[model samples]
Target: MVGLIWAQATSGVIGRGGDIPWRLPEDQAHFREITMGHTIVMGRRTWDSLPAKVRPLPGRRNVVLSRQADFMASGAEVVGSLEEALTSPETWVIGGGQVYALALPYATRCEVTEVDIGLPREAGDALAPVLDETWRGETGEWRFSRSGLRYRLYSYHRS
Candidate 1:
């Protein structure tokens, strides 16, 4: 069950200014629900984006992908290549753009949250890779977050 997980805006915005553009409590809870106790692989920026208090997400094996030969983050295992990260079965590739792209080919499933707003480019954004043919997916009914934004959970499996 190698999977990829992310929350994106309808405009395909996953991040802005190195952070999530919107704050959706339910989505945050959902992220924790899914990744808990699993092996999660992320890019260096994604690892850095995490709050210092939760940098190595609790209960999960955190693997970071970085090009810098000596890069290291406390509580995370550093792997220079995506190939090294993929060695673990049932791993989840949690992202920033490049890591998502690299994980796409090897991923069996993707869990996405589609938000209703569009963020501007200056948000220091990252876009999700397009899912063309060869994939089948379904979305749950739209629901409003506590913050009053509408969103839906989408699950896609490679066909």
Candidate 2:
């Protein structure tokens, strides 16, 4: 069950200068619940953007993709390509734009958190992969409000 997980604003913004634009703790919890036990593959920047204390993301196997052959991640295995990371039967491609686009076709499902607001100034930095006709939206859309921010969990399966 290869899946992709991330949150994006209506403007398609995912991140700004290597950091998330919002502060929604509920959305963070939703992400943990959905991807807790799955092997997650992430691009170098995504891995680097993670908190220093939780670099490996406890409980799940971490795979980091980097172009440098000698790249090293303390608690995660560094992979040279997406194909190498997809070796796991169940994996989640966590991202920073390019990685998400590269893994979109192989994703069996996508767990997205749709934020109500948009950061127009930083919108061009990073965006989620466009969802097209091949995906079938799945129900379970739950809304939550945290830190004055509102977001909804939206899941989709490849059709």
Candidate 3:
């Protein structure tokens, strides 16, 4: 079995408005691959940010973290804490910044879409979880491209 994984995107900031300016093919391919038959966890805000069409993230078991005991995301299990999310092996920590940071220690692998675009200083307040130097990574075959923007998929595993 694979270890816990982390997946995130950033414009060096948290707000989704300008976080990812475009929908890149690399992102979809990576998601379709990594999330296939895996379990995914995320915080409530991130879950809300997802488009209604994208809910359930297709093909994976979903868990959403929330403080409210009655919190429930349709098609997902409402978990109250990180411990609850970690109970399942082969889980993917898909996130908003806070949840990513919280799950970092438990993540043994990461599938990140490191956008090459730069974020303005004012907009750089939101940051993706930092994957320390100890993690090792390999590039994936998928790539996303647009007029002047380009991005690639990367899969990282803890050394």
Question: What is the lDDT ranking, best to worst?
Answer: 1, 2, 3
Query: Model 1 over residues 116-157: C-alpha lDDT tens digits?
Result: 986645545698878888789998999998899999999999
State TM-scores per candidate.
0.95, 0.93, 0.81
Candidate 3 lands at a TM-score of 0.81
What is each predicted model's overall lDDT from 0 to 1? 0.89, 0.87, 0.69
| Model 2 worst lDDT window (10 residues) | 138-147
Model 3 weakest 10-residue run by lDDT: 1-10
Off by over 4 Å in 3: 1-11, 17-19, 121-125, 139-144
Comparison by lDDT, 2 against 3, better one: 2
Candidate 2, residues 1-159: lDDT per residue as tens digits?
Answer: 789999988788999878998888888787888878889999999999999988999989999999998997999999998889999988988897999999998888999888888566463588999989989986555465857766777789974
At residue 153, candidate 3 shows an lDDT of: 61
Assess the local accuracy of residue 145 in candidate 1 as a C-alpha lDDT between 0 and 100: 85
Q: Rank the candidates by TM-score, best first.
A: 1, 2, 3
